[PDB]
Design a binder for this molecule. Structure first.
Ligand SMILES: *[C@H]1O[C@H](CO)[C@@H](O[C@@H]2O[C@H](CO)[C@@H](O)[C@H](O)[C@H]2NC(C)=O)[C@H](O)[C@H]1NC(C)=O
Ligand SMILES: *[C@@H]1O[C@H](CO)[C@@H](O)[C@H](O)[C@H]1NC(C)=O
Length: 193
């Protein structure tokens, strides 16, 4: 098990936003610094916070841009020149490409168990892949699709599927750089009808 590396704010940060990262404390570390990976090379980044309301080291990265998007790890210097790292965290920056369009082939309100797929298009920008995000959620959108027609299925829906959804740009060359959110699309599952 590797030291955890959570993100207090969403891992999805708008163009010039700012995010707060937290690493797992390691009693034997003389120094702990947030590192960002770039071409198999660890680079110092972000800023350390002060001791209060929490123990595990917290950092903060502001003025988000392409350069700050990507994989992150925590570097624990457990000696003059001996280190160990936390698990990996990914941060994506949004607002680098025009917004795509999200829609559905059904009715936005539906009985549980029903099936529905959301489609995310882009009649201009040849996005390599697409990612669907559920607004409320505190994390990183993992539900993606490479299909050009862009199909996001949700199999048998349950009351938990309800909520507002948005879709993003996304390019293979530059994976951690997404477009501006697409139009939002609300769904509501209810067994009452
Ligand atoms: C994307 O989702 C699945 C493919 O993974 C397709 O599902 C079929 O959808 C048609 C009409 O929408 C239904 O008649 C079939 O019963 C579905 N079968 C499956 C695979 O579950 C879906 O069509 C695709 N998106 C669309 C509508 O183009
Ligand atoms: C939803 O679609 C699946 C195919 O992926 C089908 O097997 C299922 O029966 C449909 N809804 C239900 C649970 O009846």
């Amino acid at each position: 098990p590797m030291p955890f590396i959570s993100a207090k704010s969403s891992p999805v940060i708008p163009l010039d936003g700012s995010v707060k990262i937290q690493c797992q404390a390691i009693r034997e570390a003389y120094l702990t610094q947030l590192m960002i990976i770039k071409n198999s090379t660890y680079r110092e980044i972000g800023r350390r916070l002060k001791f209060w309301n929490e123990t595990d080291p917290e950092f903060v990265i502001d003025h988000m841009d392409a350069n700050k998007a990507g994989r992150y790890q925590c570097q624990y210097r457990i000696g003059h020149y001996r280190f160990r790292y936390s698990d990996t965290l990914e941060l994506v920056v949004t607002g680098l490409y025009g917004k795509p369009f999200l829609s559905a082939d059904r009715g936005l309100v539906l009985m549980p168990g029903e099936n529905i797929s959301l489609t995310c298009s882009s009649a201009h920008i040849p996005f390599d892949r697409f990612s669907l995000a559920k607004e409320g959620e505190l994390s990183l959108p993992q539900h993606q699709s490479g299909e050009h027609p862009a199909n996001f299925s949700l199999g048998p829906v349950d009351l938990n599927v309800s909520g507002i959804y948005r879709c993003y740009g996304w390019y293979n060359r530059s994976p951690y750089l997404w477009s501006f959110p697409s139009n939002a699309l609300e769904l509501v599952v209810t067994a009452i009808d």
